[PDB]
Nucleic acid binder design. Structure first.
Length: 88
RNA sequence: UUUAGUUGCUGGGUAUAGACCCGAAACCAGGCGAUCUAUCCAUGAGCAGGUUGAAGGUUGGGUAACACUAACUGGAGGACC
């Protein structure tokens, strides 16, 4: 799992302003870090469906935020997906 | 109570022997054969030419990851002509 320091580094890197924790960039980066972290758990616990539901919820939330950001500003969307490595 | 036998030689018959001659399928004992053939052991040799295209591998697409998937390779088989 990730710690407060790890989350703070991501927030500081992707923040668009001072004390900015609500921007789509920050939210999507946090969700991406959490999703990449959980892949290790689901490798050793393949039959844990109850947690996989929460993982799917994280994926859906990331998709919705990405679509909203693409609608608001295309340049920011491309920059964020490039910085995070997401294919879409 | 019956009062001529016996020993030779020749001949007829019988018995024991192959016993008038020829003829089995068999049974038993001791030896000879695996240069043919059956199986096995050791050491060598042989199988023109042409098809089909298993496993495996690489790359790409796809997925939140897995799945799934296309092409290229690869050369299996009591496989095919």
């Amino acid at each position: 799992a990730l710690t407060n320091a790890d989350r703070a580094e991501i927030i500081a890197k992707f923040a668009r302003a001072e004390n900015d924790t609500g921007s789509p960039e920050v939210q999507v980066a946090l969700l991406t870090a959490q999703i990449n972290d959980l892949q290790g758990h689901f490798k050793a616990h393949k039959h844990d469906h109850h947690s996989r539901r929460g993982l799917i919820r994280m994926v859906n939330q990331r998709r919705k935020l990405l679509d909203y950001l693409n609608g608001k500003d295309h340049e920011r969307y491309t920059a964020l997906i490039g910085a995070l490595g997401l294919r879409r």
